[PDB]
């Protein structure tokens, strides 16, 4: 728990473009035939994402949250299972947290004490706790696998005036390029800022000796951009303009 | 029948009919070309 | 208890008007539509026409335009239904129905049921006259009787046996219609403890012409 492993060493920050990706449902409100303009804080088209990559290599850096973040997590044997949201990562403030025990996904806010780095087999105790969260129940499994990757999975978490608002969508397919959208899923009035955040992995043995599979995920920032939406009779976003790139 | 509708907090007048189309779950309403409310999910039970 | 109303049966000849009641009770008048379903025997239901009883405007079939004529009365909460001209074909069951509207409409109430016979034939009371064996083979322990209504018009009558008493061995036939006529017979079959204690008379009702008939076996 407190103790870290001994086989983690350092790995660069290498870059990969995203091509038409970043681009979710803006709003609920079914749209049919039109050209829609949504001013909203967007990932610029043609920009960089830094290239992570954990396989004896592993990278887990601590990046700061200014308004948004998108996450392009693409597993094989799902390596994260929670994330680490907060401000100055002690007992003092309020910091957001997502517990996933494989029934169903906790989250919860609450006086979070952290470890400098803590592993998953997060906190000594916690207490006052403004929040909870209960989600549907569901399966996944643990176990190790190396190869190639079928999936991909694409978590959106923003900011929007205290709430914080999660869009996802998975498909079947290092990062093979496209166009999709990304249904609603859960919005949570937390209301508590955060300006960090850093990667939780789950590990696997046959915190010690602990070791890991092969994934990569991806971070992405967000800017004040317009973008001008398609909408087909189904509702379904097939292309994404962005007006000040070309 | 033309009626008045409330609808959640959200007025209007019109008549109800069947929904042909595919849409979200969490939908409220939707607009039309026109961008006024042309569909309307039932606050009750899920029902457009 | 929301439950709609109608009466029994109704007689009409052809080339007149007729006009029926549904009567509806526990809920507001003008909250709800009214829908009528005919019930043709062997053809299976048919559906008359659907009001509005607040704006009273009326929503009819192809078919069945200029025959009916649907109005309410919002004072009573009572809907009606006003035939013009029926024929031989028209003769019929008749429903009333409230739709409640929530998504797709279903059927939740209906009525007693009214049974229309478009006819110029008069209204006869029934002559009722038992029947009975007069004699026994001894090959059997109980003992069976029966009624016989014949002469009257219009169809359904009531037939009880010693006034509703005997509620189980008990058969109701259907009526065959002859020469603007009407028989029908019922049978009965009771252990041998019974007959010299009790006797069985045959109890017709005759719910048109208002004559109850009673005669002993």
């Known amino acids: 728990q407190c103790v870290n492993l001994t086989t983690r060493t350092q790995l660069p920050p290498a870059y990969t473009n995203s091509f038409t990706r970043g681009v979710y449902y803006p709003d609920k409100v079914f749209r049919s035939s039109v050209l829609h303009s949504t001013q909203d804080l967007f990932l610029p088209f043609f920009s960089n994402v830094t290239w992570f990559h954990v396989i004896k290599r592993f990278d887990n850096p601590v990046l700061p949250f200014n308004d948004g973040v998108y996450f392009a997590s693409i597993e094989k044997s799902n390596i994260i299972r929670g994330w680490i949201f907060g401000t100055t990562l002690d007992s003092k403030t309020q910091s957001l947290l997502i517990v996933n025990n494989a029934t169903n996904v906790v989250i919860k806010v609450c006086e979070f004490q952290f470890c400098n780095d803590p592993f998953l087999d997060v906190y000594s105790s916690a207490n006052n706790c403004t929040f909870e969260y209960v989600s549907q129940p569901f399966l996944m499994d643990l176990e190790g696998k190396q190869g190639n990757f079928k999936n991909l999975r694409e978590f959106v978490f923003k900011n929007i005036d205290g709430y914080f608002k999660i869009y996802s969508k998975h498909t079947p397919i290092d990062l093979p390029q496209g166009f999709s959208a990304l249904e609603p899923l859960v919005d949570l009035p937390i209301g508590i800022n955060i300006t960090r955040f850093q990667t939780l992995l789950a590990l696997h043995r046959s915190s010690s000796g602990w070791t890991a599979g092969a994934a990569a995920y991806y971070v992405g920032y967000l800017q004040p951009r317009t973008f001008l939406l398609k909408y087909n009779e189904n509702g379904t976003i097939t292309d994404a303009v962005d007006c000040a790139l070309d | 029948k033309c009626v008045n509708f409330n609808f959640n907090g959200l007025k209007g007048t019109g008549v109800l009919t069947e929904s042909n189309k595919k849409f979200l779950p969490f939908q409220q309403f939707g607009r039309d070309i026109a961008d006024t409310t042309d569909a309307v999910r039932d606050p009750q039970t899920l029902e457009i | 208890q929301v439950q709609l109303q109608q009466p029994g049966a109704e007689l009409v000849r052809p080339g007149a008007s007729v006009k029926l009641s549904c009567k509806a009770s526990?809920?507001?008048?003008?909250?709800?539509?009214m829908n009528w379903v005919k019930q043709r025997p062997g053809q299976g239901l048919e559906w008359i026409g659907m009001?509005?009883?607040?704006?009273?405007?009326?929503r009819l079939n192809q078919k069945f335009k200029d025959k009916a004529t649907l109005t309410v009365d919002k004072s009573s909460t009572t809907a009606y239904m006003q035939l013009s001209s029926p024929t031989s074909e028209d003769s019929a069951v008749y429903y009333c129905?409230?739709?409640?509207?929530?998504?797709?409409?279903?059927?939740?109430?209906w009525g007693q049921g009214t049974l229309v016979t478009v006819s110029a034939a008069k209204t006869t009371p029934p002559s009722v006259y038992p029947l009975a064996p007069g004699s026994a083979a001894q090959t059997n322990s109980m003992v069976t009787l029966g009624c016989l209504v014949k002469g009257y018009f219009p169809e359904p009558v009531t037939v009880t046996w010693n006034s509703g008493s005997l509620s189980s061995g008990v058969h109701t036939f259907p009526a065959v219609l002859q020469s603007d006529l009407y028989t029908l017979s019922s049978s009965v079959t009771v252990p041998s403890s019974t007959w010299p204690s009790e006797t069985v008379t045959c109890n017709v009702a005759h719910p048109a012409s208002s004559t109850k008939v009673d005669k002993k076996i």
């Open positions: 526990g809920y507001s008048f003008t909250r709800f539509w």
């Open positions: 009001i509005h009883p607040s704006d009273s405007e009326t």
């Open positions: 129905a409230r739709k409640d509207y929530d998504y797709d409409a279903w059927f939740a109430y």
